[PDB]
Design a protein around this ligand. Sequence first.
Ligand SMILES: [Mg+2]
Ligand SMILES: [Mg+2]
Ligand SMILES: [Mg+2]
Ligand SMILES: [Mg+2]
Ligand SMILES: [Mg+2]
Ligand SMILES: [Mg+2]
Ligand SMILES: [Mg+2]
Ligand SMILES: [Mg+2]
Ligand SMILES: [Mg+2]
Ligand SMILES: [Mg+2]
Ligand SMILES: [Mg+2]
Ligand SMILES: [Mg+2]
Ligand SMILES: [Mg+2]
Ligand SMILES: [Mg+2]
Ligand SMILES: [Mg+2]
Ligand SMILES: [Mg+2]
Ligand SMILES: [Mg+2]
Ligand SMILES: [Mg+2]
Ligand SMILES: [Mg+2]
Lengths: 71, 164, 206
Amino acid sequence: AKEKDTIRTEGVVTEALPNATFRVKLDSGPEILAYISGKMRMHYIRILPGDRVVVEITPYDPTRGRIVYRK
Amino acid sequence: KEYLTNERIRAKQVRVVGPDGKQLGIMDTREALRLAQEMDLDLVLVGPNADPPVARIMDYSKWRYEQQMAEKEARKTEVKSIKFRVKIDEHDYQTKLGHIKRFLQEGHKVKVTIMFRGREVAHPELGERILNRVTEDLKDLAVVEMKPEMLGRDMNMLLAPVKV
Amino acid sequence: GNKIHPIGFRLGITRDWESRWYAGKKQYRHLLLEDQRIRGLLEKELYSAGLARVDIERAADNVAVTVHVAKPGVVIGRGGERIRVLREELAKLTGKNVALNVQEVQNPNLSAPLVAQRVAEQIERRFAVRRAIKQAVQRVMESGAKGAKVIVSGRIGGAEQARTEWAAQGRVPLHTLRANIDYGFALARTTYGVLGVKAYIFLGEV
RNA sequence: GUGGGAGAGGGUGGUGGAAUUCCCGGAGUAGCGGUGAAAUGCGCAGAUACCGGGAGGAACGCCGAUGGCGAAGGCAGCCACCUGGUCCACCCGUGACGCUGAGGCGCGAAAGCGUGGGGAGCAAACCGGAUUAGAUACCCGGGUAGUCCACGCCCUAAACGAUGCGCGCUAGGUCUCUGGGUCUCCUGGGGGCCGAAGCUAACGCGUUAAGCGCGCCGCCUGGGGAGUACGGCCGCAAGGCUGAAACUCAAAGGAAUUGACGGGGGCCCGCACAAGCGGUGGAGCAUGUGGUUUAAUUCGAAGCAACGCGAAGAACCUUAC
RNA sequence: CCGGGCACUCUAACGGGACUGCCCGCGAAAGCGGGAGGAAGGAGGGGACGACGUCUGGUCAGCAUGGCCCUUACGGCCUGGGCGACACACGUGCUACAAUGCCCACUACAAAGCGAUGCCACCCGGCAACGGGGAGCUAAUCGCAAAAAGGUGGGCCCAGUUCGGAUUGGGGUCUGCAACCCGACCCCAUGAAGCCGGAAUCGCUAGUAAUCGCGGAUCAGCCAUGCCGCGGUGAAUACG
RNA sequence: AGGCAAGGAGGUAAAAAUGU
RNA sequence: CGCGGGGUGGAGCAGCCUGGUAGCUCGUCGGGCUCAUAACCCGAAGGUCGUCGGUUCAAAUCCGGCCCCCGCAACCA
Ligand SMILES: [Mg+2]
Ligand SMILES: [Mg+2]
Ligand SMILES: [Mg+2]
Ligand SMILES: [Mg+2]
Ligand SMILES: [Mg+2]
Ligand SMILES: [Mg+2]
Ligand SMILES: [Mg+2]
Ligand SMILES: [Mg+2]
Ligand SMILES: [Mg+2]
Ligand SMILES: [Mg+2]
Ligand SMILES: [Mg+2]
Ligand SMILES: [Mg+2]
Ligand SMILES: [Mg+2]
Ligand SMILES: [Mg+2]
Ligand SMILES: [Mg+2]
Ligand SMILES: [Mg+2]
Ligand SMILES: [Mg+2]
Ligand SMILES: [Mg+2]
Ligand SMILES: [Mg+2]
């Protein structure tokens, strides 16, 4: 089906966490565990706590996101 | 820092000042030299900028030596700088606190200094939060000298020993 | 990377120019431009023929366009008429009296640009690129040329990676002037991206 | 068995000097010690360095070894005693009495702990100084246990040849130590090194085999989890033996090979540093860039190898904003 | 200057010359030390030239080209602006901070390059930039063009000044349709900071650095103190 | 006297954290 | 109220006492150094010494008062 019921919401990076996972403080509520998108990894675009990043959130479990946008 | 001696003195009419709290006037370089010789203490251009250059009758080298010694003494008793973060952990914090305590025990003043990045918005509060807590913990050994004041790219807190 | 164009290196010495003629400061650029245009047009046309040197002279508004070629009959026509048409076209392009010489090459494998072109052609209809290169080298060797290096680069086989395919034989002292190294360049224009057909041939001393 | 021999084998009793410290005595004075530099430290009540004696305790220089001994841990002044192991030579005596060894019993470095002593140095902990961002460390000044001994206990180890013991065979050479000989060479027993065959993953092993066999024991079946839990035993404790699984990872590894790298070594080089002349940074300006501002300040270039670069000619053009 | 000459320089074609060839010494050789002759000596100096590859270096903005994306606009044209904005920082250069100098005046030697709507001789107008007139070349044959530092004479006298030249006002000159943003130039006035520079640092081994001018390319003009190029004076020191 | 080498001296080999 | 000690570049402290002549560490900013960050190094920025006076040719300094800051006592009532 390839499902795009995905939320593309902004969030200022709160927490530096392991493995390029970063709890990011969304303006869609709380700070979910949001991990780096592969593109970012490829391009070596560094996320530190405090970046207003777009975070991809599936309805199934919003717990985990994705840092879509480069800050 | 050259207070200049004998014929290091180029200026014509130098204000020939005595060793202590006396003067001989504004006299020539040669005159000044002669005066120095008389005391056997060197003639020293201690204020070249002054209304004719101030020319003290002092043994220069000995004075310099004394100054050096004083400087050395000043070197030591001292201040330990404990550098915190915004992203610093609980165990880490504890470690830092322990270090601070040790320093206090020893008899050293304590600059607990936080080193910041971007987000100088949610920096200052966290600096306060850490530092205040630390101070509260070490109150038994430590009278706080400097409070948590944010200083552009850093934050300082300083602690002094209550007693040693 | 490095390596300056091998003809550029020579030129002053044993090699001679792609064209020779005097023109002063006032009219030198125009003539050059014309020559360039001619070269372009011939290339567009005679790609069939396989051409190496497009040698021009100006013996006072007697433009010379000697083609050094692999396929001589391809030039002429079937009697002597495609030679004529082309000549006419050339004349039209340049408003001056003009001629058309053909000096076909004994052993085309001796001429490096021809070889390069052949390799490019092979690549275009998709052969085993390395294999093709090797074959070319072998041909050159047979043709006697004491050295042949055939660099073909870029996406070999349509592969999605910047690859350099090499392979060589014999003495290729790309450095000494006393080498008379015939360099040949061709552009493999294939669908996935362009493959650079660089060719060298060492064929005689002094 | 007899005749010998080598030896830091072990224990018991002694002694012998150097050295250290500590005490007294003497002469003697301005520092000693320490370090990459220094500081703490001692010293005017007189240190240190020097001589005289005395008090101790500990260890054993040279010989000393790539050496010898033991089964291992280990072991060195020397002497005495008691006492093991072993090696040869004669082939004399016995007539297979042997080899191995689950358990068991015994030993078992060092540290550790118990009881009592002793205590010079060294010296965990500890207290200082420096060093350092920090110093619980490397470096220095002390310093307690401990090291030492007796008796008791602990029993682990890279307890290593990382090679279980036993015998038989399977080229040599070369050095060694130790015995006998018909002694410039033979023949035993040890210790090393090089290498035949062979083995091995290779390194390497190679009559002191990891070769070829046979004998028996010990153990192993991926790493981590973990020598941990759990029991059980042992121990005064520290802990030790005995020893999993659940889960987890598609690896943990060995040996070599190519490179790269090393505050590893040797040999080299270059205006690389030194030797020298002149600057740069400080000044203004010329320029290009980053940043910032803009309606836009077009775009790129990024350490050397981006920064008077593309641009070897931006008023419009150029020009892309 | 001319006739006149090819002698010398030169110019630019060809050719010789140096090869560790000669001698001694060392060395098995390679070669090394020194000498001789020789303009030159051990690769004579300097170029041009850059191996397999590497950094997925850099460039799709010179061109070429795969793919994607835009097609009354992410295409086209112009006019005006912007690329030059400026609280800052850095890089690269120039010009300095003086008297081994600065100014003025005379005087002397270069090379290499250019020049046709291009360079501009010479003449006058102008303080001048230049303007006008105008010969000459088609360039070894004229022109740019004066080379400068240097040499002689004069001044200045250790000062922020006859050092230094920025900024700022004013008048102009030239190019072009047009210099306000944002041109260069001239002239007059203005005369700031700077008295040899902190850590750090960079160049350079011989005609080299240091300093001194000239030519150029692009280019209407030039923000060129850049680059590229050419000569003049001409060092230091390398133990290691 | 030099020639090489063995051994003993003693001087020297400072310091310097990390990871796109 | 009584007494002692000190007030100093942004903070800690030297120097005062012995008249002239203000330093270090931490912090600020910039640079360097490094491939890069800290670390490092350098600078640059930055004090009239609490203040009013007087002394003396001249005060952080000799001297007084105020302002503070520290502490000790404050008794008979
Ligand atoms: Mg999704
Ligand atoms: Mg016996
Ligand atoms: Mg004594
Ligand atoms: Mg018998
Ligand atoms: Mg019998
Ligand atoms: Mg000790
Ligand atoms: Mg310390
Ligand atoms: Mg300590
Ligand atoms: Mg110690
Ligand atoms: Mg004990
Ligand atoms: Mg074992
Ligand atoms: Mg056994
Ligand atoms: Mg033995
Ligand atoms: Mg043996
Ligand atoms: Mg073999
Ligand atoms: Mg062997
Ligand atoms: Mg095996
Ligand atoms: Mg254990
Ligand atoms: Mg148990």
